[PDB]
Design a protein around this nucleic acid. Structure first.
Lengths: 108, 81, 99, 94, 99, 78, 105, 92
DNA sequence: ATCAATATCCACCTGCAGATTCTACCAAAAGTGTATTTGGAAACTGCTCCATCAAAAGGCATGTTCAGCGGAATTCCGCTGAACATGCCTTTTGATGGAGCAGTTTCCAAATACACTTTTGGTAGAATCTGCAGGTGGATATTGAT
DNA sequence: ATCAATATCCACCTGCAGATTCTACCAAAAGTGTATTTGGAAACTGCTCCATCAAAAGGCATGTTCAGCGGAATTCCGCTGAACATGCCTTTTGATGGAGCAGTTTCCAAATACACTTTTGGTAGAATCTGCAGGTGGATATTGAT
């Protein structure tokens, strides 16, 4: 019986897969043992953060299956996530509803 | 294949400006828009195809486009990257 | 029946409409042809995975929409409500696409 | 060729946050693009970081600085916590 | 007999003058003061190579100068010749620095 | 300190920018911008300083910082 | 004899090769890449210096300085583009005043 | 403390034997080369990875350059590049 | 057109900061010759998916009429930024302990590397499962004319 | 304001594509276990070069004044949105040949991996050297008032 590294780290994400990708990505001569652990953690955290928000938009639209629109909504509606992905395009995500005041009719 | 840039009909361009929150469009916007689009594509397709060629392929993969897009700082999600 | 919405009423109707949805707004086939043409009067005998033609279109439209916002913002800055070529220009100028 | 993905992991996590919520394939695709992007980004800063210091090894320390440089204020704050947290736990075991 | 220059005549002269030179335009000590202050918020008891402050000033000025360029353009788009806050705002927004 | 960035200097900057006329409200709006610019850059350079366990921000820390902010600078090694 | 000499270059083929390895860009490095690259770097270096050198001449000067490199770069479409996100210290800006800002007649 | 300065200076004369270069100017020139080295090496790194290649050959440097350089510039850049290798191969 | 108050320009002059020619030192390169190793081209080819062609049909593009609103041009007031001269406070510039950045060395905790054993993430793949897209009617807004 | 013409919002309804679920082969991971190498933290040291103190320079702050600029108000008409009729061509469904992307085996040019030797670019403490920053003078152009 052998315990996986993700397991030793209390993580859902692949410490092993990541450690491996760090080597083939050739970002340095060697990759310390903590690197993959820490990174996977961060990666797992971030995807959880967005999924929390996405699933909510899904909720707000009486939907059960998250779709890109939800992801887009999740992101452009969150300050930091929006900043973090400021130069990123989510296919089939549309845009956030927003209209400039001067374009609305009347007064008062 | 000749005037395909006109395949970008006025209606389509209006729809696009709508999603953009534009309420009124001058008559000269459409050709300006086709011009701008043409350049966008050329700049993207060029690189994309450069990636294709380097890979010694005849087929432009979506990754070719994904990499092309990233080079231009127009990163796209949803097509493998 | 002699019923007629005032100008701009539909437009807003249309903005709310489209900003609410997510499908692409350019005819699929025409766009494909444009790609082929450009790629071609650029390098012969090329082929495309549909996904590639679709990546380009998703990008293209995202780019054009995002641009119109900046444009729409320039018109307004000029106390107008109708975007004009000079607006697209200014945006792209400041954006860094021609300045 | 067995093309790898993060989709099963996204899915686990998904079930953790919203246990009755699902995700469309396209959405999973975006999610996958998301992860790899951040991966590259962090590993990239990591890479340079080490280089700038004449270090041949990338450690959890270089991932940490990386995360700080890359992520927006609040997110980084929590990124580090989970990060530091996973490491220590991994380190205490065995 | 008092000789007075009309509005803008000295300005244009200044514009000509400064576009021709390259000396940094903000005063050193004040600047260095500002940097260290900001930095003192990120970490205490710090120190700066002379070159690091210089790098910064060199970079900030280039930044501000360019920002004035786009700003001046936004003013002109608005048929004005006096840059205003809104002009800096618009420029920065379209630049993706604001939102 | 931010006030040390005087109107005369802000004016000089504008001038190099080819600006002929300036609304008074510009000097303050300008500093805020300059403040945000420095914060972003300085935050990043100092982060590099810590990673290198130094108490002195080096020209290179700044250079690297600028590169990250997408504002490459020449004349200081980076 | 040195590789730069065999390649007919002024730039350090060997050094480039070395820096590429220390780069962690790939696990291996072709024998000619360091050459080709050295070639490219030298060329662009020549490309600028030429224009910058002319800049100095027009300025009635003989020693090149930042301002000459700035004028050299922003004055040439290509270079200006290649360095579009780059800032040259002590370079200044190309002399330019929006027409509408000049007095009438 | 390594730098391209020395080489930069050589190339200078070759074009303007009578022209000189200030210190700061040289520094900048160095920042320039280092920059372009990185950019070209960078894409060349990527290209290999995309293709599951483990080696960066002139092939990559070339494609890399086409990708990074403006029209005409990339043109000569390639010419020059190809010359160096050609001349280099043909030599004992 | 008319001064004249000033800013700008040109040719000349000079000394000194910063560029340079200098001789020496040497560790780190860079090159040379040898032996080992392996990435990836070439050739044969399984097989995915790209171009293509058919055919029906309605979602949409095109083209027009037409009126009102929004752009553009003119006019004009009064608010405010530019030009100045005024008074001098802060920035600039040269000098000296010492905080560190940087060179050098040490030994061990941690990272390769090669060997087996083992578990899992992918997938063809026939099966099963189910959110919701899309068609629908009807109760509820929202517009615009009067 | 009353009201008619419509668009809109909503919940119920359910075929169907697209998602969840699986038995099953499984190659490629990922992990466990020594053996061997080494990167880099530590503690000790030194000489930069940086923060600090003092003094001569050289802006910046200031209040006055009025010119000229933004923008409010008013207007003319050009042009763009709405609505409608017509019917084209994009879209959807399918079937198909076969281009070319991609999987596997083979083996050789090219690359890594020392070992040994020759060379060079960086640094330094020294000496002569020089391009040009500004400082003067006098001619000429520019601006602004009358």
């Amino acid at each position: 019986k052998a315990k996986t590294r993700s397991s030793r780290a209390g993580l859902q994400f692949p410490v092993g897969r990541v450690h491996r990708l760090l080597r083939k990505g050739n970002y340095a001569e060697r990759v310390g043992a903590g690197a993959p652990v820490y990174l996977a953690a961060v990666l797992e955290y971030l995807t959880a953060e967005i999924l929390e928000l996405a699933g909510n938009a899904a909720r707000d639209n009486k939907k059960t299956r998250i779709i890109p629109r939800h992801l887009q909504l999740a992101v452009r509606n969150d300050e930091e996530l929006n900043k973090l992905l400021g130069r990123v395009t989510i296919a089939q995500g549309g845009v956030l509803p927003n209209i400039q005041s001067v374009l609305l009719p009347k007064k008062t | 294949l000749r005037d395909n840039i006109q395949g970008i009909t006025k209606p389509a361009i209006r729809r696009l400006a709508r999603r953009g929150g534009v309420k009124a469009i001058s008559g000269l916007i459409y050709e300006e828009t086709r011009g701008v689009l043409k350049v966008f594509l050329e700049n993207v397709i060029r690189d994309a195809v450069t990636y294709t060629e380097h890979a010694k392929r005849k087929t432009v993969t979506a990754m070719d486009v994904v990499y092309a897009l990233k080079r231009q700082g127009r990163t796209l999600y949803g097509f493998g990257g | 029946k002699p019923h007629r919405y005032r100008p701009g009423t539909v437009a807003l109707r249309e903005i709310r409409r489209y900003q609410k949805s997510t499908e692409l707004l350019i005819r699929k086939l025409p766009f494909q042809r444009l790609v082929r043409e450009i790629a071609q009067d650029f390098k012969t005998d090329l082929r495309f995975q549909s996904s590639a033609v679709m990546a380009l279109q998703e990008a293209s439209e995202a780019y054009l929409v995002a641009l119109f916002e900046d444009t729409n913002l320039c018109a307004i800055h000029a106390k107008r409500v109708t975007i004009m070529p000079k607006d697209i220009q200014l945006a792209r100028r400041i954006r860094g696409e021609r300045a | 060729s067995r093309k790898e993905s993060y989709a099963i992991y996204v899915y686990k996590v998904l079930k953790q946050v919203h246990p009755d919520t699902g995700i469309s394939s396209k959405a999973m695709s975006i999610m996958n693009s998301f992860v790899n992007d951040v991966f590259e980004r962090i590993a990239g800063e990591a890479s340079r970081l080490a280089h700038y210091n004449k270090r041949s090894t990338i450690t959890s320390r270089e991932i940490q600085t990386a995360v700080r440089l890359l992520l927006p204020g609040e997110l980084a704050k929590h990124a580090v916590s989970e990060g530091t947290k996973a490491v220590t736990k991994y380190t205490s075991a065995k």
